Design a protein around this ligand. Structure first.
Ligand SMILES: N=C(N)c1ccc(OCCCCCOc2ccc(C(=N)N)cc2)cc1
Ligand SMILES: N=C(N)c1ccc(OCCCCCOc2ccc(C(=N)N)cc2)cc1
Ligand SMILES: N=C(N)c1ccc(OCCCCCOc2ccc(C(=N)N)cc2)cc1
Ligand SMILES: N=C(N)c1ccc(OCCCCCOc2ccc(C(=N)N)cc2)cc1
Ligand SMILES: [Ca+2]
Ligand SMILES: [Ca+2]
Ligand SMILES: [Ca+2]
Ligand SMILES: [Ca+2]
Lengths: 90, 90
């Protein structure tokens, strides 16, 4: 597999390392999303320590109002992160 | 860096391995997009041999009508691919 192809599976891998931990196995609730960010995006994103900060990140990502981040909402999150990296973090 | 963090840079790396080859250094024209697909997505996508097929893929990706695929349009492409992989390719 190519680097692109490996990167694609890595995106799917990380979603499920976190999504299956609690409740709905196919969505990241706030507590799972916090965990993912703090453990998998520690170099790209400031550590989330306040519940308020998890809420605001989840409000941004949650396009269907169920209070959770599903896979396509996660893909939009990845697009935000990648775009920011691409821009050398503003 | 985490696997997620490495995957993010890999997405940026591959865009530029192909985007800088011809013309506008920050966009993939059809010929660059064909090259990327055939060389970097050979396990996920059928090889493109016909110009018609490049055109139709580019028509799908090109949201601002400039006939080229920029970075955010590339990110949507990646979202399509990842979603398809996630779905075990329908
Ligand atoms: N030895 C290690 N484990 C290690 C140390 C640093 C590292 O770094 C990778 C480069 C990331 C570049 C970080 O760039 C920014 C700038 C601003 C913001 C912001 N506040 N929005 C966020 C990120 C990777 C691994
Ligand atoms: N194999 C490679 N090419 C490559 C591999 C690792 C790397 O490590 C970057 C550490 C993260 C810091 C921010 O990463 C970027 C990278 C590229 C762009 C860009 N060209 N837009 C913008 C931001 C950089 C390039
Ligand atoms: N030894 C090698 N170099 C190698 C061989 C196979 C491989 O495979 C990875 C798994 C990809 C699974 C492929 O699954 C589909 C199913 C349907 C379509 C479709 N027609 N849309 C596209 C892809 C990777 C490396
Ligand atoms: N470290 C890992 N976990 C892992 C690493 C590599 C891998 O190789 C898959 C080859 C590509 C074939 C299609 O890949 C997928 C993978 C996961 C899902 C899913 N769970 N939705 C859907 C499709 C699978 C899992
Ligand atoms: Ca869950
Ligand atoms: Ca949602
Ligand atoms: Ca170009
Ligand atoms: Ca365009």
């Amino acid at each position: 597999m190519s680097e692109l192809e490996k990167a694609v599976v890595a995106l799917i891998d990380v979603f499920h390392q976190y999504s299956g931990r609690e409740g709905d196995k196919h969505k990241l609730k706030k507590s799972e999303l916090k965990e993912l960010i703090n453990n998998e995006l520690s170099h790209f994103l400031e550590e989330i320590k306040e519940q308020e900060v998890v809420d605001k990140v989840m409000e941004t990502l949650d396009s269907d109002g169920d209070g959770e981040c599903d896979f396509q909402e996660f893909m939009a999150f990845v697009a935000m992160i990648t775009t920011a990296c691409h821009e050398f973090f503003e």
